[PDB]
Amino acid sequence: QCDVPPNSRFDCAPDKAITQEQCEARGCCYIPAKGQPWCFFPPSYPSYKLENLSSSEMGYTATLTRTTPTFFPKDILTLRLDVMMETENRLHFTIKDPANRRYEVPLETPLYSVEFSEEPFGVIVHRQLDGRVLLNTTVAPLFFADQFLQLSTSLPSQYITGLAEHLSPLMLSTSWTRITLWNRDLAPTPGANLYGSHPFYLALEDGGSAHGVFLLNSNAMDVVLQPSPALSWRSTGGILDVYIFLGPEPKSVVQQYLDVVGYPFMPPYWGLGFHLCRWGYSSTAITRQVVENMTRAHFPLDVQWNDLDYMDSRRDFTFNKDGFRDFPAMVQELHQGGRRYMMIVDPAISSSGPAGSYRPYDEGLRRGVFITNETGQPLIGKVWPGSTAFPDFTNPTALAWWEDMVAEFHDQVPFDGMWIDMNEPSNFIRGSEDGCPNNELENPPYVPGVVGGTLQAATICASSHQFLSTHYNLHNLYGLTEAIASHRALVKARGTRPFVISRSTFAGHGRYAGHWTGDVWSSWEQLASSVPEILQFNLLGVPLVGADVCGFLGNTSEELCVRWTQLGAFYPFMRNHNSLLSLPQEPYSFSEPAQQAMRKALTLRYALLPHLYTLFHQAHVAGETVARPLFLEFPKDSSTWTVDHQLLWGEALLITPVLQAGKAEVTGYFPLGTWYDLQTVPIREPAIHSEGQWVTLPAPLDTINVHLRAGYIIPLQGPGLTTTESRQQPMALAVALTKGGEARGELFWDDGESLEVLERGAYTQVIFLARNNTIVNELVRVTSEGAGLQLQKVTVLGVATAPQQVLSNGVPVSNFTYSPDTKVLDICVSLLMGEQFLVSWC
Numbered sequence: 001q002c003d004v005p006p007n008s009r010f011d012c013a014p015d016k017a018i019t020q021e022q023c024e025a026r027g028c029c030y031i032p033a034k035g036q037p038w039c040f041f042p043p044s045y046p047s048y049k050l051e052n053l054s055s056s057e058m059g060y061t062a063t064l065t066r067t068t069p070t071f072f073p074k075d076i077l078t079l080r081l082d083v084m085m086e087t088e089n090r091l092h093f094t095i096k097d098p099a100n101r102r103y104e105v106p107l108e109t110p111l112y113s114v115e116f117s118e119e120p121f122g123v124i125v126h127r128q129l130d131g132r133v134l135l136n137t138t139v140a141p142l143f144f145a146d147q148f149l150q151l152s153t154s155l156p157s158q159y160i161t162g163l164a165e166h167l168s169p170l171m172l173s174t175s176w177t178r179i180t181l182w183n184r185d186l187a188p189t190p191g192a193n194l195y196g197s198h199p200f201y202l203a204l205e206d207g208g209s210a211h212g213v214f215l216l217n218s219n220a221m222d223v224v225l226q227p228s229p230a231l232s233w234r235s236t237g238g239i240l241d242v243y244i245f246l247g248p249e250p251k252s253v254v255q256q257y258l259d260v261v262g263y264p265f266m267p268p269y270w271g272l273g274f275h276l277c278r279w280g281y282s283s284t285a286i287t288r289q290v291v292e293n294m295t296r297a298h299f300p301l302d303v304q305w306n307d308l309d310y311m312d313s314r315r316d317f318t319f320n321k322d323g324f325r326d327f328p329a330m331v332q333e334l335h336q337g338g339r340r341y342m343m344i345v346d347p348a349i350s351s352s353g354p355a356g357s358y359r360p361y362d363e364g365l366r367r368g369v370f371i372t373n374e375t376g377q378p379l380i381g382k383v384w385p386g387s388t389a390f391p392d393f394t395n396p397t398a399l400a401w402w403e404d405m406v407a408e409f410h411d412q413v414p415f416d417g418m419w420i421d422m423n424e425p426s427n428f429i430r431g432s433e434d435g436c437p438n439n440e441l442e443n444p445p446y447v448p449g450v451v452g453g454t455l456q457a458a459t460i461c462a463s464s465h466q467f468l469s470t471h472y473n474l475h476n477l478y479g480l481t482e483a484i485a486s487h488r489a490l491v492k493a494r495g496t497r498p499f500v501i502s503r504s505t506f507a508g509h510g511r512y513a514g515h516w517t518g519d520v521w522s523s524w525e526q527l528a529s530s531v532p533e534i535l536q537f538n539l540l541g542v543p544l545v546g547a548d549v550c551g552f553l554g555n556t557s558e559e560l561c562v563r564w565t566q567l568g569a570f571y572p573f574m575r576n577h578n579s580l581l582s583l584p585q586e587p588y589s590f591s592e593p594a595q596q597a598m599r600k601a602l603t604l605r606y607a608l609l610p611h612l613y614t615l616f617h618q619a620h621v622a623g624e625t626v627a628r629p630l631f632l633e634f635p636k637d638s639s640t641w642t643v644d645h646q647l648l649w650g651e652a653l654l655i656t657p658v659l660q661a662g663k664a665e666v667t668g669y670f671p672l673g674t675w676y677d678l679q680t681v682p683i684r685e686p687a688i689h690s691e692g693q694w695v696t697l698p699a700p701l702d703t704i705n706v707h708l709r710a711g712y713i714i715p716l717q718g719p720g721l722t723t724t725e726s727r728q729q730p731m732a733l734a735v736a737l738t739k740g741g742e743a744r745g746e747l748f749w750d751d752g753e754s755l756e757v758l759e760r761g762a763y764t765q766v767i768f769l770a771r772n773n774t775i776v777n778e779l780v781r782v783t784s785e786g787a788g789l790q791l792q793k794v795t796v797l798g799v800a801t802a803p804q805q806v807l808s809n810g811v812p813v814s815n816f817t818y819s820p821d822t823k824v825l826d827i828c829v830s831l832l833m834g835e836q837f838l839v840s841w842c
């Protein structure tokens, strides 16, 4: 009866340290573990009972009744269960209080079979194809109290990913792991709640099938994993709103999840270029020198950034008349050179200036845009400018005011996007200047494992008021709501695609904005940790993600910055950013051989931009990932499941970086197939013929291993110091043949920044096909945007025998080279991407 296998013991004292007497008083078992809870539920612990189950066209409804109270206050004894079979792939169920509207996240919204346990109550979801049990909520009691919801399930395996934002391996440890979702300003460190919260997991099943679970709940929560294996959702409010996505492919699970929360926004092409920033570019002169120094040293740079330096007394929508007197001229110059400009914006608005002295506050105050406290005044905290109020991005008037402030500032300085920092929201003091009241929201009955042990730590009072609800319910949305507000602000101000990079995020963030991983240390550990974190954000539908290249905190080393630039060049969002007291880490600040390695990394990224842009097109229209783990592409190969120090770009490009000091080789996993060394493509084995195995590759300091998968064609474009320049260059194809002489690839092209391109059909889509010693294009769509793209080079990999002749459209080509050593046929052509062509050899 208390004979429960240790791994299957669910914690009956998650709220407090408990004694054997108190444990047995709750009706629970007390056995010290030989981590595993000492106080755990017997199989007979009171749960809810399923009653009055009925079927309809939509699905199932029932009453859940609890007869015996839990040890939490304000149990809701009568619940309503609603099970909705929404699509062949998507099962949706809610557990609500039929007597009272409870807080619900404001979001726009067969392969499975379902059965129920009566007592204790449980929802059971099978995969129809194989009968396997994916969800089973019968494993532990259902808790549904006003400020404590708990729902548990068996997991189909020890392999589960998601539940951002945390510094951890891509596959979460099931050894009694507590994962806390409570947006918190803190330098990434293991076991801590970080800047964002994504209550979604993808679970692998034996044989490489997978399913996803989304809990649509924005309250502070713990998610507890145990090695049985099983999971417990423990939220501090709202309702249980659960989506199950049946896959069966992991990539299909992600796409199914993004169907609900939104497909990733399409970035502007210039956004995929190199970004350079630091805190400490203290003048326009200094900032101009950065661009001059990069250009002088032949380093590509699309976007020049500034941190707090530009502001007047660290206030939004101002610039100082000292070092930044000619701010408008500097940004206009950047535009004249073909570059874009980004600057930091904080959420908090300085409240200390005399009335009428600082328009953002004076206007915000008048229009009631700010989060208000117990006595109905603006909540005042402390951030960079001093005393600040915090905008309420759930208030329609705050959205109008934010659009107005962005538009007015844009009329003075025409910035090309917004870097939105400190939007947890971050507070330099606890709660407010005036502290926080003593109520159940500030002092809840269950406090998740947050750093500082309070919901108020490094943020604003939980009982503060927003237009939609209390901060208690909306805190984990704050960053997301600012990203939506800023997305709209930039569309109205500029009339082209917005570019928003946000620190704080929630599920569905990728539909509006991108993300950077925050204040990472300049360390080999943080370089390695950035790979799983960038992969995690792609799975969560935020493909536009990166870490500060060479690290933010402390001083980078020349070797670290070389390796970090090499890997960082494969971040979908590539920015080098640096702290105020740090040594310079711009590419031009290093030795000649280091610069050479960093220039080579940047050159290769720029060459690949047409490919990377096409991958973002697939993310935007089909909910695909851009940077993906090997297990998303080869899920039926179980050796990929734990790989998170390699990444793919889409299906085809395998990046195997060095992540350790003093290494001149690296060992990476190579799924079954032929992998051609990308170094054999003009811009050490020529080809790795893998059975599905680990392979040691040479990797001197000037090298990063990149391999192109046999069966794939990649589009490339010639060099430039900006995408303004690069987008005008001739293009090339890299054609990686299967042993059987086949390959496939694609190109998406548009003007690179207009809104509603897909709706208006203002794009070109071309498919490339290799077969039987031929390469053709298929024209899916050709418009003015793309029709004049010049193809001048076709490189074919895995050409076994030297050709006697190479033909372009039936005519011998002007020039070609064949290397018998590397099996590479390099062909010079004069073709248009938008006109049907046929290249052949024999």
Ligand SMILES: *[C@@H]1O[C@H](CO)[C@@H](O[C@@H]2O[C@H](CO)[C@@H](O[C@@H]3O[C@H](CO)[C@@H](O)[C@H](O[C@H]4O[C@H](CO)[C@@H](O)[C@H](O)[C@@H]4O)[C@@H]3O)[C@H](O)[C@H]2NC(C)=O)[C@H](O)[C@H]1NC(C)=O
Pocket: 373, 374, 375, 376, 377, 378, 379, 380, 434, 435
């Ligand atoms: C909700 O937010 C509002 C701000 O939007 C906040 O108002 C603040 O209230 C405190 C008092 O509660 C104000 O502080 C006072 O300032 C005046 C004038 O400078 C002082 O004279 C007051 O001093 C008295 O109290 C001191 C305690 O140390 C004593 O030392 C002294 O002898 C006085 O007896 C006091 O410091 C503060 O100015 C406002 N803030 C603003 C911007 O107006 C309100 O408190 C918040 N409500 C809740 C319940 O938190």
Ligand SMILES: *[C@@H]1O[C@H](CO)[C@@H](O[C@@H]2O[C@H](CO)[C@@H](O[C@@H]3O[C@H](CO)[C@@H](O)[C@H](O)[C@@H]3O)[C@H](O)[C@H]2NC(C)=O)[C@H](O)[C@H]1NC(C)=O
Pocket: 043, 119, 120, 122, 124, 133, 136, 137, 138, 139
């Ligand atoms: C969903 O999860 C629940 C709980 O984990 C599963 O129900 C439990 O199944 C166990 C193992 O079969 C049952 O214990 C067994 O009971 C029989 C007597 O009926 C005994 O002979 C065995 O030695 C064993 O102890 C247990 O009664 C049952 N628990 C509850 C609370 O009902 C269930 O199987 C899962 N559903 C699916 C479809 O996997």
Ligand SMILES: *[C@@H]1O[C@H](CO[C@@H]2O[C@@H](C)[C@@H](O)[C@@H](O)[C@@H]2O)[C@@H](O[C@@H]2O[C@H](CO)[C@@H](O)[C@H](O)[C@H]2NC(C)=O)[C@H](O)[C@H]1NC(C)=O
Pocket: 554, 555, 581, 582, 583
């Ligand atoms: C990061 O490095 C700076 C600067 O260090 C100095 O200059 C470099 C080029 C290199 O030659 C170093 O060996 C030098 O020490 C550090 O700033 C220094 O901090 C100490 C202590 O406050 C002070 O005595 C030095 O004079 C400072 N130099 C300057 C220019 O301010 C900084 O502390 C380093 N940070 C970390 C985390 O290691």
Ligand SMILES: *[C@@H]1O[C@H](CO)[C@@H](O[C@@H]2O[C@H](CO)[C@@H](O)[C@H](O)[C@H]2NC(C)=O)[C@H](O)[C@H]1NC(C)=O
Pocket: 286, 287, 289, 290, 293, 586
């Ligand atoms: C851009 O490069 C110039 C030239 O390398 C930098 O100016 C030099 O700065 C060093 C200190 O690092 C001084 O010793 C020299 O006096 C400067 N040389 C010249 C030729 O002026 C400048 O700091 C760089 N600016 C930025 C922002 O990187």
Ligand SMILES: OC[C@@]1(CCCc2ccccc2)NC[C@H](O)[C@@H](O)[C@@H]1O
Pocket: 279, 307, 308, 344, 421, 422, 503, 518, 519, 552, 577, 578, 579
């Ligand atoms: O705008 C400044 C900045 C760094 C702040 C670092 C700091 C914070 C508090 C005390 C001292 C330093 N904010 C936080 C951002 O993560 C980082 O990229 C920025 O450079």
Ligand SMILES: [Cl-]
Pocket: 006, 031, 034
């Ligand atoms: Cl035991």
Ligand SMILES: [Cl-]
Pocket: 024, 027, 028, 029, 042
């Ligand atoms: Cl007992």
Ligand SMILES: [Cl-]
Pocket: 022, 026, 071
């Ligand atoms: Cl108790």
Ligand SMILES: [Cl-]
Pocket: 262, 263, 511
């Ligand atoms: Cl969408």
Ligand SMILES: [Cl-]
Pocket: 352, 385, 386, 387
């Ligand atoms: Cl102040």
Ligand SMILES: [Cl-]
Pocket: 106, 393, 394, 481
């Ligand atoms: Cl909203």
Ligand SMILES: [Cl-]
Pocket: 621, 758
């Ligand atoms: Cl389309």
